[PDB]
Design an enzyme around this catalytic site. Sequence first.
Site, short mmCIF file in Angstrom:
data_model
loop_
_atom_site.label_atom_id
_atom_site.label_comp_id
_atom_site.label_asym_id
_atom_site.label_seq_id
_atom_site.Cartn_x
_atom_site.Cartn_y
_atom_site.Cartn_z
N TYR A 1 -10.80 3.34 4.61
CA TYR A 1 -9.36 3.24 3.63
C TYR A 1 -9.79 2.03 2.26
O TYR A 1 -10.37 0.95 2.92
CB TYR A 1 -8.50 2.04 4.47
CG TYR A 1 -7.39 2.09 3.41
CD1 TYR A 1 -6.79 1.02 2.81
CD2 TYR A 1 -6.18 2.78 4.41
CE1 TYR A 1 -5.39 0.37 2.94
CE2 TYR A 1 -5.04 3.14 3.59
CZ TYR A 1 -4.49 2.16 3.02
OH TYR A 1 -3.16 2.07 2.02
N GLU B 1 -1.17 10.38 4.98
CA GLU B 1 -1.55 10.67 6.88
C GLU B 1 -0.92 11.43 7.45
O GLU B 1 0.87 11.14 7.24
CB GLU B 1 -1.80 8.77 6.91
CG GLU B 1 -3.04 8.65 6.19
CD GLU B 1 -3.06 7.15 6.56
OE1 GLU B 1 -2.60 6.80 6.96
OE2 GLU B 1 -3.54 6.47 5.33
N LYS C 1 3.45 6.63 5.58
CA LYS C 1 2.18 5.98 4.66
C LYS C 1 2.89 4.12 5.40
O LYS C 1 3.83 3.75 4.80
CB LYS C 1 1.51 5.53 3.17
CG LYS C 1 0.95 5.51 2.56
CD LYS C 1 -0.08 5.12 3.36
CE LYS C 1 -0.78 4.51 2.30
NZ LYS C 1 -1.82 2.72 3.45
N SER D 1 0.29 -1.01 0.36
CA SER D 1 0.07 0.33 0.00
C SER D 1 0.96 1.10 0.30
O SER D 1 0.21 2.50 -0.15
CB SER D 1 -0.73 -0.15 0.96
OG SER D 1 -1.81 -0.89 1.04
N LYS E 1 -0.30 3.07 -2.93
CA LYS E 1 -0.98 4.03 -2.93
C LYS E 1 -0.83 5.64 -2.78
O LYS E 1 -1.17 6.37 -4.05
CB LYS E 1 -2.03 4.35 -2.03
CG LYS E 1 -2.24 3.14 -1.70
CD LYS E 1 -4.21 2.80 -0.81
CE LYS E 1 -4.46 1.35 -0.26
NZ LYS E 1 -3.89 0.61 -0.43
N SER F 1 1.56 -3.19 3.29
CA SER F 1 1.46 -4.44 3.22
C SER F 1 1.60 -5.26 1.71
O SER F 1 0.57 -5.18 1.65
CB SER F 1 1.07 -4.89 4.65
OG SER F 1 1.80 -4.26 5.85
#
Length: 356
Positions: A150, A270, A311, A65, A68, A314
């Site tokens: 999410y 984030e 961030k 991820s 992203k 996994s």
Amino acid sequence: HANIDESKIKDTVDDLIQPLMQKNNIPGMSVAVTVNGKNYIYNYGLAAKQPQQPVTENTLFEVGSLSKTFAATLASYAQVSGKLSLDQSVSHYVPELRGSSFDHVSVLNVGTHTSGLQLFMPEDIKNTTQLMAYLKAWKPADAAGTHRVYSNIGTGLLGMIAAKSLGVSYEDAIEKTLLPQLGMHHSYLKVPADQMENYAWGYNKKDEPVHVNMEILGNEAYGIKTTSSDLLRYVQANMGQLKAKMQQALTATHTGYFKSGEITQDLMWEQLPYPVSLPNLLTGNDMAMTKSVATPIVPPLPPQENVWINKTGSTNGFGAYIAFVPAKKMGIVMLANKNYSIDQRVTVAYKILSSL
């Protein structure tokens, strides 16, 4: 050596990473740290167990991820290039969804996990026809923009929309435009033949060697394989440390759009206020699978220096983490070929950056 920080930093990192790998049975790791304009790369253990291969400067890890944030960077690049408006509806850019729930979902919603799309792509969706049929029939449980869930599916739409607005496929946009412009020459969605020997194996819960299987819209959500050195360059670029639209795009992904729990939700990134309390950082990194209330920040919070931006990533076989604090020009990349618990990733990263 006496009186140099690279020896101090190596001691700090070794003392945290070696017991971490022992107790979690992590075969290999690479940890990259940047501070004071200098870069430090530490490699541990094995990229593959049988035949044995060590982690080297060239070892490629799945980052899951973390991928992203590249979809977000691409959307931000399209936005700064005048090709994409984040407040427009998803169906404005994807005409086949006109008349569906995506008439009331903005591009910002899918870029901030506030559309209400679920975490995982339905497993039986394998081509575009089935995907469009699912999206045409989908209805969120709450109005878009009220809750944070999410979502891999939402991220997939963000990347697909960004690439289409630039006139290319997502794979072309990432591998032919974004990663080359960032100088990340050993980062891939598809690892080429001359780099396969550098591609670490992931080790799953049963300690079986695994590589991630790329399914529909998977490149956007979890497809990146990269070195710790390339990701450290990405961190430095996000802090404006390297040698104009691309810098504007990177920085703008740090815009804060929603508050949820302890975090500010940016464009996929984030963030938390700095100095950061470890309890709040752990809580903020435990939001991957549940719904939370989301409150808009309007006007959006401009990209900040005095914040901790992070961030997690996994796959079934890998565990990764990035954190950086622009006000201190410090950042960390932690890559592992076993998926170990996020609380441990965040705690080790907090201890390392706090030691600087």
